[PDB]
């Protein structure tokens, strides 16, 4: 009936501090389609975030890619936040540069 989102947060290119890149949050495996996805910088929502259009896998679960330009630094922490009817609280996944 309902399926909880799977989340991966990661960069388009291997991160180098001071070099511009793209931060991705790939959300998949969820149903129904209504969902909130945000990229966080030091706990704050990033305002200019784009995303792909709603599609789904052969098991009917939905997937979306959210993404934004960013420049990694040492100080800044990045994460993806997802809210969905299946979640008792928003799920926040921290970005790790080797994952």
């Amino acid at each position: 009936i309902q399926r909880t989102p799977k989340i991966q947060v990661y960069s388009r290119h291997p991160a180098e501090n001071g070099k511009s890149n793209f931060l991705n949050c790939y959300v998949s495996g969820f149903h129904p389609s209504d969902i909130e996805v945000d990229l966080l910088k030091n706990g704050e929502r990033i305002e200019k975030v784009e995303h792909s259009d709603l599609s789904f896998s052969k098991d009917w679960s939905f997937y979306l890619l959210y993404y934004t330009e960013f420049t990694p630094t040492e100080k800044d922490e990045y994460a993806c936040r997802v809210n969905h009817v299946t979640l008792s609280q928003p799920k926040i996944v921290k970005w790790d540069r080797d994952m």
Partner: protein
């Protein structure tokens, strides 16, 4: 060398308005190239890839007309299915439809697909032969009988083997720098000591297309699956994909563990070690 065109429709009823949310997305291969969203102001099919802007206004009129009519069909269907299932008017429900065609390296039709769902479960699907339907339940059996009366399979098959292949070929010729081509994985190993005695090896594949890939570990020549982790293949955002596979090993014994990378863009599977 192989290519596909797919369309995905999602209609979600709204217990508040009436007009369900309808979203249609077109793909050539793994590239979204057109979309329609009933929530949007344009009320038009819109381009989502640079190479589709080369299509004329005749095109956008025909496509907008079609998907709007499909959204109207889905709206009636949501009511019909609510009735089949004896469901109340108060809940939200979802219809999903996907269809499309695959072509082989020679550009000829290889296979077609069409499948429809209700509330995230199979409802009715076209069989592999493109000539009959599989109904998941007794409600979809009613739909199947209706579609047998109106030659719906024959119409779907004619599109899949004809216009679908014809326009897929046209779009592939429209795409140039923008159309993602086969791109072999760029690989590297990372190594993270965990304890005085274990370490993580992580085998990376980046920048590859198509998304299909196989990463495997071998220990001293034989496949290793214990103590491994594999993330689902994920889009980089630029048309290429990424994947990694990791294994935990005794520190200092990394030489026994080889990453094997299989991908259509490689003349021979790659192997790498720390």
């Amino acid at each position: 060398g192989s290519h596909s065109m797919r369309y995905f429709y999602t209609s979600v009823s709204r217990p508040g308005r009436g007009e369900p949310r309808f979203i249609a997305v077109g793909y050539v291969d793994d590239t979204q190239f057109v979309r329609f969203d009933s929530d949007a102001a344009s009320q038009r099919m819109e381009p989502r890839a640079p190479w589709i802007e080369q299509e004329g206004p005749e095109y956008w009129d025909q496509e907008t007309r079609n998907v709007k009519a499909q959204s109207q069909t889905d709206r009636v269907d949501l009511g019909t299915l609510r009735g089949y299932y004896n469901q109340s008017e108060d809940g939200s429900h979802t219809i999903q439809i996907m269809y499309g065609c695959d072509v082989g390296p020679d550009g000829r039709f290889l296979r077609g697909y069409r499948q429809d769902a209700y509330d995230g479960k199979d409802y009715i699907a076209l069989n592999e032969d493109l000539r009959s339907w599989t109904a998941a339940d007794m409600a979809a059996q009613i739909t199947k009988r209706k579609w047998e009366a109106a030659h719906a399979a024959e119409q779907q098959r004619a599109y899949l083997e004809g216009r679908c292949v014809e326009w897929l070929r046209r779009y592939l010729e429209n795409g140039k720098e923008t159309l993602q081509r086969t791109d072999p994985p760029k690989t590297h190993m990372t190594h993270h000591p965990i304890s005085d005695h274990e370490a993580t090896l992580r085998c990376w594949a980046l920048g590859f297309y198509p998304a299909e890939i196989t990463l495997t570990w071998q220990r001293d020549g034989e496949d290793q699956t214990q103590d491994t982790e594999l993330v689902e293949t994920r889009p980089a955002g630029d048309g290429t994909f990424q994947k990694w596979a990791a294994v935990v090993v005794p520190s200092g014994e990394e030489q026994r563990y080889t990453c094997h990378v299989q991908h259509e863009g490689l003349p021979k599977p790659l192997t790498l070690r720390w």
